[model samples]
Target chain A: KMFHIALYEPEIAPNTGNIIRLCANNGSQLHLIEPLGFDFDYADLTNVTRHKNFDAFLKAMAGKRIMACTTKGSRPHSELSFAKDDVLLFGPETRGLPMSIIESIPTEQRLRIPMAATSRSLNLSNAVAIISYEAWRQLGFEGAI
Target chain B: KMFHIALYEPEIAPNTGNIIRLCANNGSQLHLIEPLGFDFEEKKLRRAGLDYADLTNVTRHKNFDAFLKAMAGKRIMACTTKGSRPHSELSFAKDDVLLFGPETRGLPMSIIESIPTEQRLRIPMAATSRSLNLSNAVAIISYEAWRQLGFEGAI
Candidate 1:
């Protein structure tokens, strides 16, 4: 079992490409929610990884719980516990997870990657890497050298 | 005291630009060693961070020696794949200088050896992977440092 990284309405080509590589290199799986900006032409993308819409993706991930990455999150990402089957959710680069979607998840399950007050947020792909690596590290970097 | 993040001959514009904004937001200073890939102009750099580039505290050194001269008192933690210790094992100080090498070739052995064996660190990764993206590496390591400091100056 491995973590599932879900990208909600991601608009950047390079960010999505890099994230796919990040997930594949690590043990995590990639799940893209609908309305991606770039073509689904990457060599690695499959029907299972690249969803056409959010509902279809949700249907696929029925059992596993979701932990969103948002500024409104009460728990610092570092302080939270992660599991192999858990789903890590992130939003688009320009706008974060919609308030409605973020509020849907329980506050305790919501996590925030800490940042300075003067800034709004980190780059989308960077946030993905940071959290992905942390979760992998906690899992003892299971397949890593 | 604030952290100083030094990049040695960084060849990627977006990575360097993203790191500049990362340093600014986290209250650290950025030092770029000579021979960067892109111009220092603000316009081309905006795709990564917008106007945040202007807000960051940036210093351009003529070369690696000038950067070293400025960082005389602090412990220089050289990051590389050849490191003896994991990055998580180190206790970062506010004044510490976190050094990273270029994207193509990692920190030269001479530079990596200058730091004591225990001081070098490698971010854990799969054996099959060559490296993480440069910007992503900076974000992960910088956030670790900032988190250790209790998220100072952060909202």
Candidate 2:
């Protein structure tokens, strides 16, 4: 079974690069929606241009399924009653999924990592790594070779 | 109890910087053993600089002998890629010292073998896997250990 995880509309290029590296190494699928903060082609903004890692990313994610989910849905992630095949969804980097989208989705499917009030939330890549690792671990971190 | 995390002869500075950030963010201390690969004061490495708190909280140890002398009364938990025990299985006390080794060559097995059976652990990874990013493994295992000591709820 393939493991899938998505980042709604990412803002920072570095964070996205880090996630690309992480997911590629872990054998997971990554999704990025539109409205990204930086131009994916910008060299200085996305230093990955120097290494051509982005090109590698596109190659690895090719043929993997992706679906855009609006955060406004009322469904909580837990409430989605996760089927093994369901793709996990996340919202934009800055403000998170729109309330309207969240409201529309099952409330149980929405989840957030608890953090200290002083620290708004983890860097987007770190949050994805933590959650995805937890999900992957639960699924038995497969592979024989 | 003051929390101490020691890394023995680390090679990668970025990973060290990452751990510094992790320790600073979590209110823990990172003690690094010396003879490092890159200077923490170098500029190129500074390009990936950590936030100010990381520099403030991360300390350097003189050597293993110095560490032994400093931790005379403390119980140390050594982390090695080759360690036989699962890190998650160990019961972490708030004050226990967690130590990691250099990334390329793990802890000197001779020394690790001599440490009392109670103080060594290995992070869990998929079989045949090389290992995880140094700091990330620390973050995951440390969080789990902290969670185990009744660190439930937002704190």
Candidate 3:
């Protein structure tokens, strides 16, 4: 019922780091698809990094299901009936999930985070947080850690 | 219902900056009570600098009394790990000020103890944990508050 957040290609290091901390605190898993926006080695992220918790999050996500929702995805996210453990993948903050990659995912696997018209989209980490919360709420916010 | 998120003596630039943006997106106001943790130079908050949105909803306070005065008509929800009541138990109102303490020391015990016992709240957490990241903790509380307000659809 809860979402496993995926940052397909997050650009901002600090934002990524913050979301990493958020996922850990909320009992959620984060998936980095590929081609991240900033180097994971950035100083800010490194300095603030909580190494032990990251390892813990990685351990919890070990066998969880992960779906790649790239621009090349063949399945549309809306068509997929996600189980409690499935993660809805996303892409970079600046450029959205590439069309080719999104198209490659099953048509049923494609979905969008609802957005307010004035803005194109939210910060990638924020989107994951928002969607993850909403999905978890849909499940009554139960079993939240 | 609207939120008045006040950070008492916030020391971290990014934490304050991120909360400012969070307030902007969530229809909340940010009140920073001094002494601040970092220089107010615009560049410091650049990570969250997405134009006027940051400045649009922010206000600074000279002291605790100044913040209390400015929030004349609102109830203040001071967050602390040691609060006797759980945050979820409170029936939040639209105009509550969710006050927080500094990143390091937290709200001074005297300050928290001064609040009428009825107004204090602590977000529930595991017994062994310290506390969630400040920004993350604010986000969680803000969203829950907004949800209670029905997200009111553009409030």
Candidate 4:
């Protein structure tokens, strides 16, 4: 069982680097749709450089159980029943997943990591850890001890 | 319910700065033991401190004993790679203090031994991976606890 993490146009080197380690630790998969800020040499990451636009990105995510992480989302991440193969999606550092793209999915699939209203979002890498680990924990960490 | 995060003689400035934001975001409190590599006046942490100074809940312990005395009677869970229990296995309570070691050196054996055997927890990582980014590790655990608490007081 693998959790596929898709980052849409990620723009940070260290953040993605940290995530690469995270995926390896948990035996998860990393998916990236281009315009990435840094070069990823890791074998686990899927770096896509030639996606046309946001619409194409949305089309690429057609049948996956895409859970979009966004501040505007209403569903709490913990409340959602996560499957092992579910796709947990995230946006870039500067701007989050485009509103049009997020809305393309059902409201139920759009999820948010709870945060204090006064504070900004957690660091990109940290957010990935939170969600990815939760999903892994739910699966009883199938391949890990 | 309040969650407390204790950093044992943390060395990196940026990691601490990022943790500050993580704590503030969850409304959790932060505790730091002395002998840090960079001073509070260092530009990196200072700049981050300015943004979160008022919002975050922080306590500076002069020494390990001071931190112990202040947190007496509470469950102290030490995060270490040597531990047998995975972090998620432990049912965290409101009073549980999650203790993490310095970046360069993990918690000393003596200090780790001071904690109950069951309290020693490890964040799961790849065998070849050194460790998670400190700030990222904090966020994962803090969020788990907070999530279990039903996101109380969260906006």
Winner by lDDT between candidate 4 and candidate 3: 4
B34 Cα displacement, candidate 2 (Å): 1.1
**Model 1 stretches astray by more than 4 angstroms:** A41-48, B52-55
lDDT of 4: 0.78
Q: Which of the predicted structures, 1 or 4, would earn the higher TM-score when compared with the native?
A: 1
Per-residue lDDT for A88-143 in model 2, tens only?
A: 55666668766654564454555544332223234455556555555554555454
Tens-digit per-residue lDDT, B36-153, candidate 3: 9787765665655555544767888899998878888777788887666755567787878898888887798878887777778765432225356677667666766776665654
Q: What is candidate 4's lDDT per residue for B1-155, written digit by digit as tens? A: 37889999999877787787788788778999997777776556555544534434888899999999999988888888877788887888887899999987889998899888888888776444557778877887888888778888787
lDDT by residue (tens digit), candidate 3, A1-145: 2457766556778777767665654456555644555665232232222223324434655776545544333432323455678766667666766666555555555554321112323455554554455445455555643
Clashes of each: 0, 33, 37, 1
lDDT of each: 0.79, 0.58, 0.63, 0.78
In candidate 4, stretches whose alpha carbon ends up further than 4 angstroms from where it belongs are A38-62, B46-56, B126-129
Q: For each candidate, what TM-score against the reference?
A: 0.92, 0.67, 0.72, 0.89
Summarize candidate 1's per-residue lDDT along B75-151 as a digit string, tens digits: 99888888887777788988889899998989888899789988888787653444778888787787777777887
Docking class of 3: incorrect
Better of 1 and 2 by lDDT: 1
Tens-digit lDDT track for model 2 on B1-155?
Answer: 33677888889876676666556544566888898887876574366554453466667777888877877887788777556676656778776788887877878977788676656776444333445556666666566565565442334
Give the candidates in order of DockQ, highest first. 4, 1, 2, 3
Listed for every candidate in order, the interface RMSD values in angstroms are 1.9, 4.1, 4.8, 1.7
Highest lDDT against the true fold, candidate: 1
In the order shown, the candidates' Cα RMSDs to the true structure are 2.2, 7.0, 6.5, 2.7
Q: TM-score rank, highest first? A: 1, 4, 3, 2
